[PDB]
Assembly symmetry: D2
Amino acid sequence: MEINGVEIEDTYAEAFPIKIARVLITAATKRWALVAATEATGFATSVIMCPAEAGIERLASPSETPDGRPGVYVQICTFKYEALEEQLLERIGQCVLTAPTTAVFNGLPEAEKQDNVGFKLKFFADGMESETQIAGRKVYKVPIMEGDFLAEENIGAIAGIAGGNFFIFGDSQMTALTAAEAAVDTIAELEGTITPFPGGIVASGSKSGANKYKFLKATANERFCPSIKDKIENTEIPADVNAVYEIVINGLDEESIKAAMKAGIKAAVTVPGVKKISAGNYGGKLGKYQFKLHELF
Amino acid sequence: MEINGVEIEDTYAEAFPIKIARVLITAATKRWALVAATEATGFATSVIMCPAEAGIERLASPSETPDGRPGVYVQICTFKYEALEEQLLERIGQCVLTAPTTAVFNGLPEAEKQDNVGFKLKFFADGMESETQIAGRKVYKVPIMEGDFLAEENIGAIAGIAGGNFFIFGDSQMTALTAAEAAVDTIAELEGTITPFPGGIVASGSKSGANKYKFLKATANERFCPSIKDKIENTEIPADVNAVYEIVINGLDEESIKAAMKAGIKAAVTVPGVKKISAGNYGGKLGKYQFKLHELF
Amino acid sequence: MEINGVEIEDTYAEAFPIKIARVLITAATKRWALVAATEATGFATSVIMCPAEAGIERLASPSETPDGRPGVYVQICTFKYEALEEQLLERIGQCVLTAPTTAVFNGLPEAEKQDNVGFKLKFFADGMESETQIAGRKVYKVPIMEGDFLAEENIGAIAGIAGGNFFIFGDSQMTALTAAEAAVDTIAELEGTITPFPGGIVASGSKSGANKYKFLKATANERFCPSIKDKIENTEIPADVNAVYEIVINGLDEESIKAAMKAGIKAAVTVPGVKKISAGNYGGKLGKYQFKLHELF
Amino acid sequence: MEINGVEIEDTYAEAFPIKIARVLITAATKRWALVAATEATGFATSVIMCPAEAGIERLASPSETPDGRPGVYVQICTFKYEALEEQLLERIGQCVLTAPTTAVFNGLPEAEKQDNVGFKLKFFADGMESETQIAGRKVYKVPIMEGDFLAEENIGAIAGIAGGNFFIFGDSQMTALTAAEAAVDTIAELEGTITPFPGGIVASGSKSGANKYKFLKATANERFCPSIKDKIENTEIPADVNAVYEIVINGLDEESIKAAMKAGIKAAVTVPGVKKISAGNYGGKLGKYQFKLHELF
């Protein structure tokens, strides 16, 4: 199969279950919403080695937010609902309560799990807390130096998906990166998904375990490394390919991960010099969710 | 004392000792160096509940970096040296090694303390690592999907200073915030200092204890909360002030913190409506370093 | 009427007829599309002394463009169609054809007036030009140093509207500006409208003619100048207002100008410190279109 | 000659004399200074068909500006001083006087030619204008909606140089463009130079005259068009090069243009896949100036 002359390999991405909380952050302007959302979701590329897996889902319009202010939806992800609450508390308390002009609202109002993060945050006000109602929502006011920090009582969390992905093979590093850049921008327009790696993009890649250093949990997949492809006789890097980037995608449900993969791939293949689109998996042996590339189109 | 008509309080900032590692992240472009530096220094506003205290010190010119490429100096800070090496490993490994086009060099090369982060990261290549020399510096090549990730053997660290600061009182929220924004942009031009809070800016503030919820080691200082200044009879907030922002400054030495406080204050008072500059201290009974505002000028 | 506690003055904006060409600029990434769109719509705040009035209407998703690439819709506006065609030729030929990775498409394909800029631009190729179809659209290929510049044959123009507007009265300059910024960002999300002033925002304001220098086409309206409100008997600036910003909106039809005004106003009034919303007209006897604020809600 | 393994052609850039005016635009923050600087220097890639050649020379620190505020130095260029004064009045009057929070100061205070743009702009105030002194400079206050617009009396100008340049040959479009991006960010650090094309970068290129359409002053140089290199017996495009980008540099003197050419090339050649650096000239038979590439190093 080819889109724009670019081979889409008949394979699938293997994705795992993960606990995902959705938080709406509003602020005085877009810039300040984005500043807080970025800080809150930093140091969160992969939960296998980071405190969490987090990122920006989409920009929120003034027309859809409880307070009518510009905002940013973020997702924060961990394996356990407990470590998720701990992350919501450390990240929202230390990076959003402390950020200029922010309010936090529940991104998953209908979720069965509801961590009472707004409630727990109010105590920082040390007696000066207030309770008010924004658009039918139970919100605590927390007087701080800037004014009132507004936090809705609960943050919703569900079981979603981590590790939907696709690989971009390019003739040069900057060809592949530009494809990846165009893919992440498109996915950042879509609801339900995040791309937790730096700028949304995996530069490294990974195989489970190791060949030489068996103590390590994960290592570079030598078969996807362009610079050593002539030493690696089962290499996935052709002679006309000099770089691969991967886009890792997390999301609330299967259909939102698929929409992100489809849109991202179609954006990626618009860059001249892209040689192949593929995806990473583990055989069917680990991940429950399997996104077949060909079924997207 | 007034600067530009703005009252400068005759007080001082109270700063604590901290461990600081300086890292240079280079990348293909300014934009990719900033993506990596930001991801790597997020979720790190305060070591008192974040994994670290971190931020961007200043942009690196292509004319000054080991590889002649655009870069960003970051500082990652922590109380104990053991925790720092750990934070360096996790933040550079998960947020820079994985980020597009990045190389990591030692920000504090002549420093006495050195963490061998590059040596430790090379193991990711699983036998495929190499060793090269960039501008006299010892560097490890780690083959990954995009190409080769370059990481200098060591990252230096020193005994630095956290918690230098000044307060900005404004007639309105956006007056005080714009003043803070101008101060943060100014400080980001300066070598040796960072401003670890979201956007460099503290919206919250805090006192050392609690009047009510004694199970909290720190709460909002109600004396600097404008939205409740009428029900707080020992309020530090004038009737014509509606918002206060604080800029916290970590740095390598005392001279750099002072340069940052001075430049930041001088930029802040250029914003019309700013009423007063102050600073936060703990009676002199908590931190070794005293930065007196009037001695800056 | 009050929205969010801010007085909406019972008045109207007086808008004029103007010719508007709509152009879609696609590029390799959002960033490059924005670079070209920004260069091409610069020096174009008011046709009363600029070669045109022009701006960014809104970003284009890869999912909606003819080539599947990210894009930006811009509007270029003049009083006469003939001046519009020169501006299209000069602005596109010199700021888009020369800009990295761009393609131009017709933003008003179903319009009666069609300036064949694509045809005219093909002659830069000097014999080496070609023809194609992108998405059922007729496109000329112009070989240049970067690759092939693609330009659809025609660019559609209509009789649109210039000078929908509202004024934001704030307690400080940064209160009023932040309100304006939030409004411009909201309007930049909306189809059909641009905001041609720098950053979308009018800091100056004007009245027709003069009191003193009668040889001038326009001068500052002393009535809306806060810094001299005490030396002007007929001042429109309340004692509690220290700054006003205006947002000018050009647009394709009345529906889209009303939507922009409504949306921009609802965003502006979310900033604490905003005292009044108003609009500027000329007494009903210079403008063809009158948009009354109270009708918006 | 090679730098970082990239062949530098023994050729020269051919540059022409041009009038250059230097202007300092300050504002409340970097962002607002950049907005105004950008609007004022847009639609100004080439004096050939644009009303001017203009661009951002470099950002100004709060520590170096007359008012202590962040700023941006811009250059605006025409062939005759007659056209220049018109462009200063029109670009500054329409794009800077109208822009949020800006003030303007003379960027060339010692130049012999001094255009009295501030004097002329003050008439906008219609009798309400006044005179003040900022850091020893004669400045006019023009009351407007936002507050007071401050404009220094004169803007200096000199006979400078337009059309210093170099070409970047890449293996792919995005390789060449990333090298050009890196080059332009570097030159934006340097005093005395601008890069007037969109985002600093020339995607088109040109030869004097035409092979076919002789009614044209300039056409695409088919010898540097990679798209059709197999159709042009005369091609300067190697088989392994797929895209060329040019950086055009205007500047105050030869030395500052040389420095930008040098720093630009040294940044360009850090991007993997760059094949060759060159420059554009006109046989030596059109321009007073000739910058030899090999003589830069």
